[PDB]
Design an enzyme around this catalytic site. Structure first.
Site, PDB file in Angstrom:
ATOM      1  N   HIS A 195      19.197 -34.489 -31.956  1.00  0.00           N
ATOM      2  CA  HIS A 195      17.835 -34.135 -32.385  1.00  0.00           C
ATOM      3  C   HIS A 195      17.715 -32.610 -31.940  1.00  0.00           C
ATOM      4  CE1 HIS A 195      16.345 -38.019 -33.570  1.00  0.00           C
ATOM      5  NE2 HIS A 195      17.073 -38.518 -32.558  1.00  0.00           N
ATOM      6  N   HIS A 232      19.460 -37.097 -42.150  1.00  0.00           N
ATOM      7  CA  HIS A 232      18.409 -36.940 -41.154  1.00  0.00           C
ATOM      8  C   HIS A 232      19.084 -36.458 -39.842  1.00  0.00           C
ATOM      9  CE1 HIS A 232      19.251 -41.222 -40.002  1.00  0.00           C
ATOM     10  NE2 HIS A 232      19.246 -40.615 -38.724  1.00  0.00           N
ATOM     11  N   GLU A 284      13.208 -35.046 -28.003  1.00  0.00           N
ATOM     12  CA  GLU A 284      12.242 -36.095 -28.344  1.00  0.00           C
ATOM     13  C   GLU A 284      11.440 -36.509 -27.133  1.00  0.00           C
ATOM     14  OE1 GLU A 284      14.453 -39.061 -30.909  1.00  0.00           O
ATOM     15  OE2 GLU A 284      13.104 -37.891 -32.319  1.00  0.00           O
ATOM     16  N   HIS A 310      24.439 -39.029 -31.580  1.00  0.00           N
ATOM     17  CA  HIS A 310      23.816 -38.036 -32.527  1.00  0.00           C
ATOM     18  C   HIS A 310      22.842 -37.179 -31.686  1.00  0.00           C
ATOM     19  CE1 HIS A 310      21.320 -41.518 -32.433  1.00  0.00           C
ATOM     20  NE2 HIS A 310      20.238 -40.710 -32.659  1.00  0.00           N
ATOM     21  N   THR A 355      14.108 -43.898 -32.207  1.00  0.00           N
ATOM     22  CA  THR A 355      13.130 -42.890 -32.535  1.00  0.00           C
ATOM     23  C   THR A 355      13.044 -42.629 -34.028  1.00  0.00           C
ATOM     24  OG1 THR A 355      14.256 -40.819 -32.402  1.00  0.00           O
ATOM     25  CG2 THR A 355      14.043 -41.952 -30.327  1.00  0.00           C
ATOM     26  N   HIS A 415      21.671 -38.436 -28.067  1.00  0.00           N
ATOM     27  CA  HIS A 415      21.480 -39.876 -27.917  1.00  0.00           C
ATOM     28  C   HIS A 415      22.848 -40.567 -28.193  1.00  0.00           C
ATOM     29  CE1 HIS A 415      16.993 -39.334 -29.036  1.00  0.00           C
ATOM     30  NE2 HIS A 415      17.120 -39.228 -27.713  1.00  0.00           N
TER      31      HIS A 415
HETATM   32 ZN   LIG Z   1      18.135 -40.545 -31.692  1.00  0.00          ZN
END
Ligand SMILES: [Zn+2]
Ligand SMILES: [Hg+2]
Length: 255
Positions: free
Chosen positions: A92, A60, A102, A90, A194, A115
């Site tokens: 997004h 993911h 996000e 990590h 999240t 993040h």
């Molecule tokens: Zn995150």
């Protein structure tokens, strides 16, 4: 759960009911509604002694893991009470440059969002922290398309190696101080992770100032796979979650 048409964020409430929580994340930051709190202290990021261990593709996203047996890289000050230990960071990202983050600034979406995750070190371990309302500290950094970010090249170059789900790679001597903006001005609010289990454990600290990365840097991100080696290839893109209801909660600004 994933970000597919059939296991996307719109379906997580079934497996993880807190999906419809009271303190869910991400949210839209209305810069005109954010409350200037002069009682907020400056953030303090001590990452000079950071120890990176490896990079891993969890199916993911990819995680850059750090040794959190001691106070090597810590976050203190600001809205937090006590020290928080950097366990991982990590990203997004979107399929395109118009989406990916996000959190949103006045409904504006960035290409990516970094993040940096930290746990309250009066709870002793991560597992324990996620049981507390003030157990974790998410350091949010927006990424926009422009000039290359030197400090991010290392990460980008090793992605080849963790192409698929389950792959990991030694990733020591990586200095996180290289992924930080000039200014530490931030917005803060009570949220959650999240992604599943979406524990309502987090204190969000979203920086005003985004870091810029090149088109070819964000491009290698999009080349990662959700699938496991030898499965039909599903590119790892738009691994982000739609904003949630503030719901009475209030966003404070340090500026
Ligand atoms: Zn995150
Ligand atoms: Hg919690």
């Amino acid at each position: 759960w994933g970000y597919g048409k059939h296991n996307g964020p719109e379906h997580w409430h079934k497996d993880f009911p807190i999906a419809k929580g009271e303190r869910q994340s991400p949210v839209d930051i209305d810069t005109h509604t954010a409350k200037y709190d002069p009682s907020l202290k400056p953030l303090s990021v001590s990452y000079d002694q950071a120890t990176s261990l490896r990079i891993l593709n969890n199916g993911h996203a990819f995680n850059v893991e750090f040794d959190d047996s001691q106070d090597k890289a810590v976050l203190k000050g600001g809205p937090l009470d006590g020290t928080y230990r950097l366990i991982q960071f990590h990203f997004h990202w979107g399929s395109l440059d118009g989406q990916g983050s996000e959190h949103t600034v006045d409904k504006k979406k960035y290409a990516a969002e970094l993040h940096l995750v930290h746990w309250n070190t009066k709870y002793g371990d991560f597992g324990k922290a996620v049981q507390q309302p003030d157990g974790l500290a998410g350091l949010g950094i927006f990424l926009k398309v422009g000039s290359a970010k030197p400090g991010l090249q290392k990460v980008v170059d090793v992605l080849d190696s963790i192409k698929t789900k389950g792959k990991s790679a030694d990733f020591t001597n990586f200095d996180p101080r290289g992924l930080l903006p000039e200014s530490l001005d931030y917005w803060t609010y009570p949220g959650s992770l999240t992604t599943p289990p979406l524990l309502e454990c987090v204190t969000w600290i979203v920086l005003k100032e985004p870091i810029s990365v090149s088109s070819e840097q964000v491009l290698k991100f999009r080349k990662l796979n959700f699938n496991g080696e030898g499965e039909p290839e599903e590119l790892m893109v738009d691994n982000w979650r739609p904003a949630q209801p503030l719901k009475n909660r209030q966003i404070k600004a340090s500026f």
